[PDB]
Structures are given as structure tokens and as C-alpha cells.
Design a protein around this ligand. Structure first.
Ligand SMILES: *c1ncc([N+](=O)[O-])c(N(CC(C)(C)C)[C@@H]2CCS(=O)(=O)C2)n1
Length: 113
């Protein structure tokens, strides 16, 4: 394990997220059940090749990271929410997580460095 990893991510918020608003939608109205459907449907399109992960993150991620195509940069442990941190460090570079639940919402993660 390295001291830091670099990941991109796509976040789908829901109405019970920590902050139920984003850059692309002033009030998040969708249920967590609908947030996961989207996450799972993004995963299948990324696996089929129909969709590109960073194109999707730049259009639909409810996180400000979307303006950088999903990239967060490099981070060590002790910084992000534990579920995101653990999931990110359990990835090989170039590997894409399944769903990841944090207080912010539901995440797909892709380790790059
Ligand atoms: C979304 N876009 C950017 C970004 N960031 O600036 O790193 C985050 N972010 C970190 C902050 C705490 C907002 C600085 C996420 C918070 C939830 S997370 O653990 O998935 C990382 N989010």
C-alpha cells in the first residue's frame, strides 16, 4: 500500500445525503433507491463500453469534482470519509469499485495512481 492514492469518482446524491444539493441540481429529490439504480446502470454502461467513466462523472456527478472529470487528486488516509478511503485503497490502479456508500451519497471510484 502506498502513502497516497489518486482516484476519480462519480457521486450520485439522494434526498437523505449529508448535503442534498449539488452544482447541477439545486434540490436533490431522488430516493436512495433511485440513486443506486443510477449507480448500477452507470457501472453496466462502463463495463459494456457504452459509456466512458470520466464523461459520465463530468456530466452527472453531484460532486464539484465533476468539473475535473471526476478526478480528486492524490490523498493519504485520515482525510476522506472512511468508506471512500477504504474502498479507494483496496483498488488496483485502473480498477473501478462497485457501489460505495458514504454520508455524501453513493460513489463509483476509479483508482488512477
Ligand atoms: C466532491 N468533489 C470534490 C471533492 N473534493 O474537493 O475533494 C469532494 N470531497 C471532499 C471534500 C470534503 C468536499 C473536500 C468528497 C467529500 C465526500 S468524499 O469522502 O467522497 C470526498 N467531493
Amino acid at each position: 500500500e502506498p502513502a497516497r492514492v489518486r482516484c476519480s469518482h462519480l457521486l450520485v446524491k439522494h434526498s437523505q445525503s449529508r448535503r442534498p444539493s449539488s452544482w447541477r441540481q439545486e434540490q436533490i429529490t431522488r430516493t436512495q433507491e433511485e440513486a443506486l439504480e443510477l449507480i448500477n446502470g452507470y457501472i453496466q454502461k462502463i463495463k459494456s463500453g457504452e459509456e466512458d467513466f470520466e464523461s459520465l462523472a463530468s456530466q452527472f456527478s453531484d460532486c464539484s469534482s465533476a468539473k475535473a472529470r471526476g478526478d480528486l487528486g492524490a490523498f493519504s488516509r485520515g482525510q476522506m470519509q472512511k468508506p471512500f478511503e477504504d474502498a479507494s485503497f483496496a483498488l488496483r490502479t485502473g480498477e473501478m469499485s462497485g457501489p460505495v456508500f458514504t454520508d455524501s451519497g453513493i460513489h463509483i471510484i476509479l483508482r488512477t495512481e
